[PDB]
Amino acid sequence: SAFPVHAAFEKDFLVQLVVVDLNDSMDQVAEKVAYHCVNRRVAPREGVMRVRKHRSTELFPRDMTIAESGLNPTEVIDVVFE
Amino acid sequence: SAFPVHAAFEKDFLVQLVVVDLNDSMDQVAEKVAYHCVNRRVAPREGVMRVRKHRSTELFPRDMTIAESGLNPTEVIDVVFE
Amino acid sequence: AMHPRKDWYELTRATNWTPSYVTEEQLFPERMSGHMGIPLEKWESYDEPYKTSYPEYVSIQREKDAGAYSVKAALERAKIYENSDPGWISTLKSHYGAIAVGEYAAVTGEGRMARFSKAPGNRNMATFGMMDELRHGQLQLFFPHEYCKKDRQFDWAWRAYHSNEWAAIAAKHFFDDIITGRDAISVAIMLTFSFETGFTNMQFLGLAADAAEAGDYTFANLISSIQTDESRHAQQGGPALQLLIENGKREEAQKKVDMAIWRAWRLFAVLTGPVMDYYTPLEDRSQSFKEFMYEWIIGQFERSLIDLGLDKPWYWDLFLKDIDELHHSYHMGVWYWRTTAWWNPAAGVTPEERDWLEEKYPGWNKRWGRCWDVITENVLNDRMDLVSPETLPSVCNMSQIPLVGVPGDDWNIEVFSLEHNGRLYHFGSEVDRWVFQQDPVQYQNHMNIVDRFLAGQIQPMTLEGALKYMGFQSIEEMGKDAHDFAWADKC
Amino acid sequence: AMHPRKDWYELTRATNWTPSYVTEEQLFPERMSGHMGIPLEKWESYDEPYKTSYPEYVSIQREKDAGAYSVKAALERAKIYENSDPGWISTLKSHYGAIAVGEYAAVTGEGRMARFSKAPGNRNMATFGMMDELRHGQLQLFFPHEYCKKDRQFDWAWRAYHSNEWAAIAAKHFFDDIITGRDAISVAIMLTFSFETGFTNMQFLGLAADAAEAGDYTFANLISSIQTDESRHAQQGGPALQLLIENGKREEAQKKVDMAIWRAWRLFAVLTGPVMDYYTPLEDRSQSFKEFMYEWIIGQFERSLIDLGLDKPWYWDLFLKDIDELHHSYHMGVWYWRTTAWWNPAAGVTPEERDWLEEKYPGWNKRWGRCWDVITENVLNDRMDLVSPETLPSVCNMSQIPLVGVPGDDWNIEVFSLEHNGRLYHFGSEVDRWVFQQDPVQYQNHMNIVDRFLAGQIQPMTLEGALKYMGFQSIEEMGKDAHDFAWADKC
Amino acid sequence: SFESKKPMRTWSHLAEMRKKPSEYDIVSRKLHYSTNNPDSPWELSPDSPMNLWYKQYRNASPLKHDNWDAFTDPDQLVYRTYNLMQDGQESYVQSLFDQFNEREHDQMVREGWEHTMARCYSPLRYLFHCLQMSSAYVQQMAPASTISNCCILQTADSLRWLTHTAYRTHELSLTYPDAGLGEHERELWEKEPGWQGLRELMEKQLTAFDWGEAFVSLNLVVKPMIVESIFKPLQQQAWENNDTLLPLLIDSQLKDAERHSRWSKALVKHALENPDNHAVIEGWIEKWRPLADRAAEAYLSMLSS
Amino acid sequence: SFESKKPMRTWSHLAEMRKKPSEYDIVSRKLHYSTNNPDSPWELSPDSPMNLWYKQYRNASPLKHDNWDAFTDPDQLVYRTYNLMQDGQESYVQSLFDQFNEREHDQMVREGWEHTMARCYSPLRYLFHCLQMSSAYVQQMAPASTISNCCILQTADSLRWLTHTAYRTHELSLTYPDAGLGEHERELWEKEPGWQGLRELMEKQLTAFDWGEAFVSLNLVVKPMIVESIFKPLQQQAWENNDTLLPLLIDSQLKDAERHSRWSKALVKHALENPDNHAVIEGWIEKWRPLADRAAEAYLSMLSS
Amino acid sequence: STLADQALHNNNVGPIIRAGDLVEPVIETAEIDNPGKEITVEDRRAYVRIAAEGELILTRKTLEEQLGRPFNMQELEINLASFAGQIQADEDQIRFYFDKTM
Amino acid sequence: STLADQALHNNNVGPIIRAGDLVEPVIETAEIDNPGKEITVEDRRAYVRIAAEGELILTRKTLEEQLGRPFNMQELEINLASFAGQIQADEDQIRFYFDKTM
Ligand SMILES: [Fe+3]
Ligand SMILES: [Fe+3]
Ligand SMILES: [Fe+3]
Ligand SMILES: [Fe+3]
């Protein structure tokens, strides 16, 4: 059920390997990524974290799971604020 | 009338060429030497400066002139306090 | 009497002949020779512009080494190791590890030309090139060797290329691509022309300026002497390029140069960039990394490239933007993940240094400065756990260096991906992806360190497992903050 | 194959023969040879213990210079001149001026032995000695030459020995006495044994330690390399001394050693003493002058002298007292009369330095410290006229150095005078007077600088006239306080 | 966890030597990382062209040893000491050239000797260059840096001989401008019967791509033949024709040649730690000896004509 | 007052050269302070023994010039460059010795040649040492450092020749142990007629104490005779007796000898700026030539016996 | 890219000499052997960048004179750490030069 | 004169080696070639004073081994800045020694 992706967090300097779960929501994925970013290289802020395919115009719904999203493992995503 | 001697002043570090006069008193010679010593490398002090042949036990009288002393030019003298 | 070299030099390189007992192609196979179908006779017009001869070489090279070694000997007690800023010592560790055994590898590139180039002058100059790189490899093992007894990280002057440490893999992927992994003509263009007249001046002369400012004359004297050899054997590239152009292969030549320059750039950005703008003590920064780039690559190298009749690379404008940006991110990452390096990176963000950075790179503080603010706050609050990573960075499938972008106020990061033969690759730039596409058979089945981690080749699959996989043999060998965070006392 | 030196060395020195067309005494005149009537055959037992041969010499000496010059070249930009304490720069000025052209003079001492010694091994080793001193003279002109363009005082590396400046006269009176002014045997004993195994270690190795502490590797490397030559050719002295003793001339030998050691001592006390305890920055004082004396002269040289079968000098106890005292007074005088020197003496009496002096020389402050107190008070009160002399010091008729004693609380000063052939001479020690009496024809009609001043040879007869007489060609060339009195800010 | 360890006195790989590591040990040993990973010699796609080349021509060689790196140049030469030695030799050769030219040596050779040199001596530049190219191939393919180092120096030595030959060809032409010296060497190498055995030998040798076969053919078969069948007969012919320079020059070149033989023999001794290697090496010698023998015969036939 | 002056680019004494001072200029020129004060060469009593010696044998020489210091070694050698050149020459001679010994050169000389060497060659160590001693005397007495420097190097060169001779005497004795090689040279120098002209010449020359006469006799008369009457006849004899080493060795020694002649000639040219000096120099040559001629005749008579 | 454009559009040629005894002599030589050219010098301490417009010649004869000791052209390699321009070298001189004018 | 007496009454012999590549190898050699002697070392940075009681031998074979490169005994002169003791030198070794015992 382990699902590796590569994630870029808004205002960070890099892309990182973050292993999420096949059944995680786009709210949870955003948490697992943030853990490796906010308060490390990125200042914390108000707002709702969202997930999208890299540089996509389309945001995934917050409730949608990765399995339901159609993402393939090792694909690249961004975590951004509304 | 110029009369060169070499003079060592009490508490100085060296012997110096001091040119005195054939008719100077042992009070004046002591002055001409002091000029090159006191307040330069030797602290000033109370007392009467006296002249003697180098390391001699005999002091010359204060009123005696160098001519009367029998000193030869380029001979060595000390200037000391009583 | 003796007769002047000009009177007999032609005979030293009158060595081409028409094979009869094997075919020309058997004797000079295209995979090793890279003659591009150009007939033997055309290669005889090759004229090395920086000539020497065997008796002159042994005499002159004898004198070069006597000075290098004499200086090292006379300065053993200068307290460089003991009194130098640790950022400077890490600069030495990085240099020797990243370079010594790659120099020895360069012998093979030169050897490839000495056996397989159809140009007689090239085969002779390549023979001196083999000797030169032998010199360079031996110097750069000999010099750091005395420091083994002081610091296990100096072991990496020898160990690095034998390891799977990420920077060593990035070095080997590059050098195996441009030096040891291609035909003689590709070596002439990618190594002797592109890398050796292009970039090495940055590390062997730009860094020497910093070394002299830091009062490390043993090192400055060493690397500047080494570059005098480079200047001669690098001149094998230009005449090969001229010959290709004259024989209808300009497009092929341009492509090789374009590829080699970008590949070298990304490597220099991760190793030399941080050295020049961060590890080197501020008072010793002769010029910024960008400034040296503009002197050596733009002002000198590119102008020479144009003079020979090639064009500015298609990615010119991307390259210029990259010079402003890339190494700042590479530095940040090398430091955050310092524990995977064999040197101790210095953060180099004291207030005084950040002012210098702002002056050299307007807008720095509103970008990278934003991440350093967070890092700094944590340090001042002893929240050290937030100053060490708990995952791996994503890595470029070409350069083998993590995927980065511009942080802070105007955040922008882009990965350039590619599906190919049922596999998904990720590249850190448009150019890196283009390089892969120029020669997929060279790269397609290579797996970067993170590919390996995900594929089960790194056991256990943990940060510790990865550190062991990278060849670290003791705790002391892994990178740490150069000043043990003492810099925070200035913030 | 080649045959080992031991198999053929004897033939290189089988060069004595029985003269037939001139007499032995015509060929080896006693005034130039100094054989003391010892027959030619006895001199063949002379066995130089530190041998070399021509092919080995040119090869080894080639290597010695390559290193010396390479180091100088590699460190040109080390900012020694610009960043060094001025006390250290004055140390360089003093060294080069007092030494370069005296080294070249040493060629003549070696030449005197090469032509006039009856010992074949001596004549060959003296030939290498001639070459060595040529090396030394040329090195020590070449090295300071680049500094001419910075400071006219560096001109004195060449000019000193051509001048009548008081220290130059003291240097020449000594070197002309022990090197150029006597027979070959006297040269062997006074120069190669006494001066060259005795004292030069102080200036060429003791000072090198200070130079390394001060971070001046060009200079430390230079002088230590020079001393490797000294160590070889100085070994001509011991075998001559052994031969003299075996042939009933021990008393004559002892006298020559006794004289040369005292003569060298007074010169080193005025030049090296102040360098080591005052000009050299405190943090760079590897050991005190006395400490180095105890290492090199007492611990090493005197022990070697005893091993060869000679006795401690008759003036032993006077010499030991002198080591405690003399250079402190010499320093004080060189500084007070700084304007007659071609270097800028440093006072070296900051509170921190006076504590070091007290520790190295208990009682210092109650003696010399008393004079420095007066000098210091004047400086702090801008009474600068009292910090410059208005007369000449009285000068020793042997050493040519002013007559001094112990100042302060237990004042004691003694001049040792002598009437001789209707003239009155003054000496700074019992030993200096004794030296004169050993060989009056060598000295009796010499006039010291002050004798000349009083005799009308210095016109005009004034301080200015004397400065001009001493060869100063501009105002800049005359000595000044090394730090322009900035040290007073520490008092 | 990791473990804590103190600094080592030398490289981790040399740390278990009994002896203090020498300059040679420090700068020469175990530098080929390309032997670390049998599937991927080079840090690229495992099936990249050069990776396939190395897996076939190095890794798959029938000449096998589990520790090639242990090999030691019996001379233990490094770049620094090689240059000291060869500057010595080249300065000596330059001195000979200069003094023999001063004495007009070339004018006093036996009548016609210039023609023998033009035919049998000057085209040696081709042969020596082949040795140079071939030496470089063994360098790049050998499975240990200590081996490759001997090959680098041998490649240089080959160019040294080439250069001597070029210099003397031109110089001789100054005294004998009507013998084709410096003019007809390529044609001679290509068409003259005396040269064809050697040319066939080298063209074929240069296409032996297995590192083991390349080494054996070059260093154990070709090079010893050149010593016995070319260098020494030339010295004898020179003696018979009042050429006193050539024997001295060849003596200096032979010093190089004996050095190549010395390290070659030492590599054989190392290889023979594996008894399998005897038949492998012996087989390659038997394979190439006939070509080598025919090359020498033709050359000698030409020389003594 | 004094005046203020800025730093000079070189020594005050060279500051008025048009050209940038060379290494030679910087380290060689005007170093004899002993010529500054005519009454007191040395800083001692004006009538000290050495001061009297110099006033008589240097200052009072009939060979006169008002600026000896202006003299320039035409080779402009300094210690550093001399050693580079001579290490080159000695390395070459060592290479020759080693290779000729390898080839057993000494065994193949003409029968009896060992006896000719024992008699006419090995005692040269005495002659060369005399040149060495005499060169050192001119060094210490010459009135300019640039002159003395040429003499220092010539003294070294003399010991170089002495050393060659010692080495070869011993080596030859290894092949011919029954010819008195290394055993009877002193007796030959002292008693053999062929050597007596040379011995008388040198004993007398070594007692010419005027610096000018010493130089002229040594460098203008003795040394040129040795070149023409000793070195070259030996080369010819060696040729006739299948000694091929000796001519090469002598060629290297002759390079030294021509260098001594070069600077000597240049000193003459400088001296001749004073027209008075022609008769002075000519007079000394005429004085010593007879002894020199008789020395050569006796030696040649011995050699060709 | 104005900065980069300007940097690229130069015609500077000449030697980069490493710190040592050749620095000053090479600068002097560049001046003497290229009269009517302005010689520029950029001092980076470990090396010096010496340049002229379009072409810069160093003759062996002049370098030997400025260096003050016997000198063969091939020795320049000991201290020629880099160079701008194409190079044309022989026993008598080295020429740094461009074919094009930017 | 107690201090001076004690200083004079020593039997220390051995090389003084100038700063450079011979320092450590000579110390190691002194230890190896004189077992059962204590080797003393005084470090003055520009030179090192190495000594043993009565006699101290350095063999060429051992020095070559500790130095790590081919070495001829005569080369020691390059770095032998001084020495205590009388000296006995040949192609195979150097011996520093005293005749007397103080
Ligand atoms: Fe390199
Ligand atoms: Fe290179
Ligand atoms: Fe000296
Ligand atoms: Fe000396």
Side-chain angles (χ1 to χ4, degrees), chain C residues 402-428:
Chain C
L403 303 170
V404 295
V406 175
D409 287 14
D410 64 333
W411 179 58
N412 183 81
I413 184 171
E414 187 168 11
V415 179
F416 300 85
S417 302
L418 184 64
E419 297 180 68
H420 169 71
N421 292 349
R423 186 178 157 191
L424 187 64
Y425 306 78
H426 303 297
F427 303 98

Side-chain angles (χ1 to χ4, degrees), chain C residues 127-357:
Chain C
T127 296
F128 297 116
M130 289 168 66
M131 289 284 286
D132 293 338
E133 305 298 7
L134 182 63
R135 180 189 185 220
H136 301 167
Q138 299 195 157
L139 282 168
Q140 287 168 299
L141 289 171
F142 185 88
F143 273 55
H145 178 262
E146 73 168 297
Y147 292 135
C148 288
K149 66 178 79 68
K150 295 203 176 304
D151 194 316
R152 290 186 65 100
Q153 286 181 333
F154 275 106
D155 190 59
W156 288 73
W158 168 83
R159 197 196 314 177
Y161 279 66
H162 293 285
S163 88
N164 288 323
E165 190 268 351
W166 69 270
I169 286 178
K172 283 187 283 178
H173 190 279
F174 172 73
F175 288 128
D176 292 353
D177 194 12
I178 67 150
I179 299 197
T180 65
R182 295 176 182 273
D183 59 87
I185 293 313
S186 300
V187 174
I189 299 165
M190 301 182 177
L191 172 65
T192 67
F193 180 70
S194 302
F195 185 66
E196 301 195 311
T197 78
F199 274 92
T200 59
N201 288 326
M202 288 287 292
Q203 182 77 181
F204 290 80
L205 292 177
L207 183 55
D210 287 3
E213 297 302 334
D216 187 353
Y217 301 103
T218 288
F219 183 74
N221 189 67
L222 166 68
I223 57 172
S224 70
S225 172
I226 283 169
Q227 203 67 353
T228 67
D229 297 325
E230 183 83 298
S231 295
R232 169 174 35 72
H233 65 243
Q235 284 300 302
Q236 294 173 271
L241 280 173
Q242 287 169 304
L243 208 149
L244 295 186
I245 292 163
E246 282 171 358
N247 289 87
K249 305 304 181 179
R250 151 191 299 275
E251 184 176 338
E252 292 86 339
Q254 179 79 43
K255 288 203 185 85
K256 285 186 189 305
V257 175
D258 293 345
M259 165 274 200
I261 289 297
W262 189 263
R263 291 228 59 197
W265 154 242
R266 300 295 278 212
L267 188 58
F268 270 72
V270 71
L271 298 180
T272 306
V275 162
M276 280 180 168
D277 283 8
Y278 299 94
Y279 304 172
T280 290
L282 172 61
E283 329 89 65
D284 300 320
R285 297 173 195 169
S286 183
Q287 297 188 88
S288 75
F289 180 62
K290 171 180 182 171
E291 287 171 343
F292 275 129
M293 286 296 297
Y294 273 62
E295 172 185 355
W296 288 106
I297 303 324
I298 299 180
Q300 178 173 136
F301 173 72
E302 294 292 351
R303 175 59 180 94
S304 82
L305 181 157
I306 293 184
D307 211 67
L308 288 177
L310 286 185
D311 302 313
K312 287 185 269 191
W314 65 265
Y315 51 71
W316 189 244
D317 287 311
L318 295 167
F319 175 48
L320 299 179
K321 179 173 186 291
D322 234 28
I323 293 166
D324 288 343
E325 298 178 343
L326 183 67
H327 78 293
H328 292 305
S329 284
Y330 278 177
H331 163 63
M332 181 172 298
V334 169
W335 185 92
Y336 198 83
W337 276 261
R338 58 204 175 270
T339 188
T340 66
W342 73 77
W343 60 99
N344 302 326
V349 287
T350 56
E352 192 172 345
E353 290 167 297
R354 297 176 60 148
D355 289 342
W356 181 84
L357 294 159

Side-chain angles (χ1 to χ4, degrees), chain F residues 68-86:
Chain F
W68 288 115
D69 268 313
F71 171 72
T72 299
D73 175 5
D75 291 34
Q76 296 186 211
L77 286 174
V78 304
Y79 182 85
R80 189 186 63 82
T81 58
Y82 173 90
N83 289 148
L84 291 176
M85 177 181 64
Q86 296 304 76

